[PDB]
Symmetry: C3
Subunit: 448 residues, 3 copies
């Protein structure tokens, strides 16, 4: 259900029919691994079977110790947030007196419990790995019985499997300085994360969304290492919560629109700068200028509101009439007529200027269209590639209807003699008022 | 072999003698892993070796299930592509009815075959891991014989080794949402990648280039997850093919050039904006502004043409005469007189202005040159470091001849009273015409 | 310990009380893994145990062979060559007999200081001895028992020794021989702590690097070097912090606009000099891209190559933006958009037009509704801030914030002569452009 319209008048295109999944806030959950303190490693004896357990135990002890030492266009308009301020703030609460004992006591009988913290916040807790009981009750007795010798290779391997996850958690936190993204399957296994989602205080619609897109949920999550206190390692996994789901979204593609004069430098250029993603959101429209921060799975767009501006619904009018009076559409102006192509959701916008060769090709037929100078467009139906100069573009092969909206290029309505060709953060009305002021300066001087 | 020239007139430098290897297109290959779906693990019982086999199978069974849930300046001129549109398109073709079986039957007897897909395109296929046959014909018969008990721990390891690759593949696809780059060695081993290149429909020069730089080929490749259906897991590996090789290429380094009067704010500044890589390509010049997107191995430059502009060959004239009439050299203007240094391929450019302390040092001598205000340059022969203010630069110690092209700094030729110092995307002639137009308006008023 | 001032006059805030740790130079160290080239594996593949060591041994040879086959305002900063230093050390190692010096000095110990031919002395470190493991412990066991191994523990011990060499190969194979950060497979934590401790640096420096090894990794490079004779060597390029314990402050800026009701009648102005500022050697190192600096508690790890060197008078933009001694940087626009900049101890809120902006408490919800204009809220009673459809969480680090009241500076500009497309301007640039455009209006009136 994806459609696209090419506006030849403004050298732009809109892909519509996408569904929203906007991160509006954060959930913080506490993931704990229970460890055992190893006091006296009195094993000597250079025996092949003995050496492996002793070296494996040193790996565990070193990893525990290693973790303890760790504690000791238009994008520029956007604001700046503190991505993990929410998760880290929960992490500071865990350093308070007795805060681990609440967690540790609540996770005594089950691996999943809701803990009320000292500040009042209720947080999911999750014991994902119990190394204490394995070492204290199953390994050390077996190890001790035969004087630091183990007569069964299967016991050393079972320990390597148990120990491996803690080793990789440490490995990730040591090169990521205690905050990772995405949340790897070592920090949170696939089944654990699904259990987190099913127990979160969120909608059934929300749970379904997160559960069918765990690969995206990881990518929008942080894992923040926290404490190794008492006999427990805890880290906070900061998961995105999607407060806006299933509202309509559209992607605006824009490209340079220039005159087609024969004189090299007599040309004028004009580009819509408002490129990016747009989603309906609470009666307004969330605008995401850097479209690379959004991830598209099939027809759903996952974006993050911290990278958005909040705009009136009338921003959509820039697609139907760039000179409409209700919203001042943003553009930049230049004298730089260079050829390029913008691959859209359902086709290719081609800005072909000068002597550059611009064509569109089929896999079975070769070149099927040669572009004339100006901004033109091609659908992904008969076309597989587009070539602009020495640049070959592949076109998206997603199915869907394109509509070519015929229109006179807006750049023709400007007189090159009064055109301001150095505006990067301008608009329809700003360029108008700059021409009018430059045209009145030229009219009043002739009346002199 | 490799040479460099510093143009004192324009505060820039060009490194010559580099060879091209431009990514111009894509090859997509289908890499398959054959799995066996095992319904239930009906051997529930305690035994050291049995317990390991059960956990190893449960890790394997979850891996299949986890995969199944997975499937359910001047840079701003470059334009936008769809980086994996080619591979993703091939991925969709594999979803058509019976298309997997065409692949599967062709790879029954060998691990490498060329398959003609339903849309007609021929794509190399590659069975890299046969777990179905291993589990169905080697492990499950051994396991079943002794009521799921194995008298050989070596059986567990061989399975845990075989299974390891499938587990890591799932790990990569699970945090990358099915698209990874560079292509890891779990997705494609070094030997498998060399075997693909040897069987690809490319030149012997092309096969040689890709084979001697497999680390680069990986870094420029994508691995696109496709289907896990029937007894086949398949993913598409999208490799870059280098259609332009061994053409002369050069890198342009630029730095700001300003006046050096003692009065703080009476100064004017000028910078060439066309820094980046330039390669001859099909009679034209491919310009890469973003020099970070290019990889240099020794003397070969690996760039990607979608991050390029296609420019006329006369761009190279900006280096011999910035005021040439045949190509309008791009520049920016400012009043921001800040000190900096730009390290070149063979030396160091120094923009030293105001009261900033700028020196060049030798390891055997200490400071050997102190820069005066203005733009200056040093060769890498006797110099190891360069210091501009509080920042120490190390110089590349690559071997090669340097040439200092003496010339009067271009900034002296402009009148400070009429100089337009707010142009970001301007040029020699644009600054000329804005001065001439601003100089004539003051001439026309004085006639009064 | 940490304080913050909000300047309502210029819609900005400064957080002070940070201490510096500026990377100023590089230490290059040579890390070696000793390998053994194995001629003929003319064993049998019948016994289950032999197959594993033989296949594990084939795994090793491929890794050895594979490695041989391998052989605002940011735009002002300038260009460096990040690993020119370590690569320079690597190039020296290709010279005749220079590898033997390394190998003979690490004959008896695993750590040695070597003097290179060009005269520079570099710490050396043998981190893995696979040659000796294979030559003296594995291959002798193997041949004796008729090319078969009767102890499963022997194969695992080899798979463990070999595993690191395999994982190193995976990393250089995917990184084209230059990695960052330096992984724990390239340099284990104990080795890195030993390297720092044996480095020719201050005790203040060693303590700093040793308590922050995770940051030392992130600022380090591993440059794959040579595989010649019986040794693989790679250079680990470590950051040395030549500026420590000087005051640092972060400047946060947000747009400051007029608040007329007429849609497009508004004027805007924002300070562009946002980023980190640290005193060092009588001047000020300015870091515009604030994402390249890492904060641990109250220490700011920055890299001087991503910095400008500024006169100490830059701080005057915080006491009076119109000072004549330093021309403060600004950008000007007519784009009256709402946003928020979260600072160390609070939230700057630029709320304009019809956008809904509130500050909320976890126990009370909305506790302040902002009026149009640029305002600021301390992180004390506030946990979150919402500007339009975006909820920001505020930093909860403890510290005092002070609200400096003032008339917004944008009100001192006349809307008729205001240059509204200046990105790299200044107080003095906009002043003289008003004079030039306001005087041009006088010539017609005197006419
Ligand atoms: Cl502990
Ligand atoms: Cl060619």
């Amino acid at each position: 259900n994806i459609t696209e319209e090419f506006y030849q008048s403004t050298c732009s295109a809109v892909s519509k029919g996408y569904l929203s999944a906007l991160r509006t806030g954060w959930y913080t959950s506490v993931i704990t691994i229970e460890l055992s303190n190893i006091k006296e490693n009195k094993c000597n004896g250079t025996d092949a079977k003995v050496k492996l357990i002793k070296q494996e135990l040193d790996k565990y002890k070193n990893a525990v110790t290693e973790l303890q030492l760790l504690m000791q266009f238009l994008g520029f308009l956007l604001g700046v947030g503190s991505a993990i301020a929410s998760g880290v703030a929960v992490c500071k609460v865990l350093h308070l007196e007795g805060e681990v004992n609440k967690i540790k006591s609540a996770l005594l009988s089950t691996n999943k419990a809701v803990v009320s913290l000292s500040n009042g916040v209720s947080v999911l807790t999750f014991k994902v790995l119990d190394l204490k009981n394995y070492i204290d009750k199953q390994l050390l007795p077996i190890l001790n019985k035969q004087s630091c010798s183990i007569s069964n290779i299967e016991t050393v391997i079972e320990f390597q499997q148990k120990n491996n996850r803690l080793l990789e958690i440490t490995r990730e936190f040591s090169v990521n300085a205690g905050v990772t993204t995405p949340v790897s399957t070592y920090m949170l296994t696939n089944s654990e994360l699904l259990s987190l989602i099913n127990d979160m205080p969120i909608t059934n619609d929300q749970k379904k969304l997160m559960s069918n897109n765990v690969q995206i949920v990881r990518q929008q999550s942080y894992s923040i290492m926290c404490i190794i206190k008492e006999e427990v390692l805890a880290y906070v996994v900061q998961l995105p919560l999607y407060g806006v789901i299933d509202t309509p979204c559209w992607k605006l593609h824009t490209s340079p629109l220039c005159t087609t004069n024969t004189k090299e430098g007599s040309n004028i250029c004009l580009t819509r700068t408002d490129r990016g993603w747009y989603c309906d959101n609470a009666g307004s429209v969330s605008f995401f200028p850097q479209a690379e921060t959004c991830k598209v799975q099939s027809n759903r767009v996952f974006c993050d509101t911290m990278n958005s501006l909040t705009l009136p619904s009338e921003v959509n009018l820039c697609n139907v009439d760039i000179f409409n009076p209700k919203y001042d559409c943003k553009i930049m102006t230049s004298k730089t007529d260079v050829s390029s192509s913008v691959i859209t959701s359902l086709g290719a916008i081609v800005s072909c200027y000068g002597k550059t060769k611009c064509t569109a090709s089929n896999k079975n037929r070769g070149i099927i269209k040669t572009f004339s100078n100006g901004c033109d467009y091609v659908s992904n139906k008969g076309v597989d590639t587009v070539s602009v100069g020495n640049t070959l573009y592949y076109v998206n092969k997603q199915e869907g209807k394109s509509l070519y909206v015929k229109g006179e290029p807006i750049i023709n309505f400007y007189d090159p003699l009064v055109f301001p060709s150095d505006e990067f953060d301008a608009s329809i009305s700003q360029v108008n008022e700059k021409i009018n002021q430059s045209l009145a300066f030229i009219r009043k001087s002739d009346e002199l």
